[PDB]
Amino acid sequence: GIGTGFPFDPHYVEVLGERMHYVDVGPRDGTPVLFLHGNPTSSYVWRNIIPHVAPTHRCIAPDLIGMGKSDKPDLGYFFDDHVRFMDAFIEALGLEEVVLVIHDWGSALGFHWAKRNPERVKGIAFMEFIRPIPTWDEWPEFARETFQAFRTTDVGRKLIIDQNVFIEGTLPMGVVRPLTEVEMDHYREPFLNPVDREPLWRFPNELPIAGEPANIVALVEEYMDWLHQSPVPKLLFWGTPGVLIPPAEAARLAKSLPNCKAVDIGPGLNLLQEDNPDLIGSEIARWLSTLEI
Ligand SMILES: CN(C)c1ccc2c(-c3cc(C(=O)NCCOCCOCCCCNS(C)(=O)=O)ccc3C(=O)O)c3ccc(=[N+](C)C)cc-3oc2c1
Numbered sequence: 001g002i003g004t005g006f007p008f009d010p011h012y013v014e015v016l017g018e019r020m021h022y023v024d025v026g027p028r029d030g031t032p033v034l035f036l037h038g039n040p041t042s043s044y045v046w047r048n049i050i051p052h053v054a055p056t057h058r059c060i061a062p063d064l065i066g067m068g069k070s071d072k073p074d075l076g077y078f079f080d081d082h083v084r085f086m087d088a089f090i091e092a093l094g095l096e097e098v099v100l101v102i103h104d105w106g107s108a109l110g111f112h113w114a115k116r117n118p119e120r121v122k123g124i125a126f127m128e129f130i131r132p133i134p135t136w137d138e139w140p141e142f143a144r145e146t147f148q149a150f151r152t153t154d155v156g157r158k159l160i161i162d163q164n165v166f167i168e169g170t171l172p173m174g175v176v177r178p179l180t181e182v183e184m185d186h187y188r189e190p191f192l193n194p195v196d197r198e199p200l201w202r203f204p205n206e207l208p209i210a211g212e213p214a215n216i217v218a219l220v221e222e223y224m225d226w227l228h229q230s231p232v233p234k235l236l237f238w239g240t241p242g243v244l245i246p247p248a249e250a251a252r253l254a255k256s257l258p259n260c261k262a263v264d265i266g267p268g269l270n271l272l273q274e275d276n277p278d279l280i281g282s283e284i285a286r287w288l289s290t291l292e293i
Helices: 079-092 105-116 141-150 156-160 165-170 181-191 194-206 212-227 246-258 278-290
Strands: 011-015 020-023 035-037 057-064 098-104 120-129 234-241 260-268
Touching: 011 079, 011 246, 020 181, 057 120, 057 194, 098 105, 105 120, 105 212, 120 194, 120 278, 141 156, 141 165, 141 194, 156 165, 156 194, 165 181, 165 194, 181 278, 212 278, 234 278
Parallel strands: 035 057, 035 098, 098 120, 120 234, 234 260
Antiparallel strands: 011 020, 020 057
């Protein structure tokens, strides 16, 4: 059985006047491994992968601001808000050099931070990450109209804020195998009140699709350009058919990104962690030995 529980002790750090929650396990010395979750998850999405890395490496898994057990300030939760909070989280924890394990919107946070701090990143494991979607044709047909509806302030907010569709429908449709009730309740816990769902709606409205928003498209194209040239060790997980990263894209990236290892995880949509956590965790563990950390 795939683990459903969250046994990690809570850790907190005051950041920009707001308390943020993070998982911190593993030995204290050596290079830490920073796990960055996306939408609409939390450090809970790393629950079955950390146990493969925690025996030999420090594992830090924060909850993004307004998500998980972190505080819920009255912000718009634009990507720029998450950048400032994640920049200040990393400094508040005194992290010097790190290995990144990033997913979904956390990957945009990881890549944007690694582009600005390339000396402090010894490797990047990433899966179902954010890239420029040139046209709506590059978005999966089965989820296309709903995400077009998500990116509006009337129908989009009604679905996500008022009806919580992103948790009750979009999240299960990002996973191939079925999610138990206990797993669903963990993902529901930070969003029982419609107020807390603002990041669940701003995130898909920040997706770089068809040139909008222009600022996010430029930002993501920048770190994609850095990724195509930098020699930082890269580990990419992908599944079939995926959502953000289709198999043909993963094959292209596996040849064009320097020092990159691609790992097929089998069937998979967006939350690859939930469809094959053992392969992801045990491959990250094996890959960390090939780094000079
Ligand atoms: C439990 N079961 C499997 C479902 C499945 C679907 C639904 C749906 C549902 C969702 C969708 C839907 O979410 N489509 C789109 C998902 O496909 C995206 C998958 O990749 C994205 C992963 C996340 C990526 N994160 S990022 C980068 O974006 O930040 C479409 C139609 C329906 C429908 O019903 O007619 C419900 C709709 C309304 C509703 N009421 C008003 C309370 C309840 C719904 O309940 C559902 C339950």
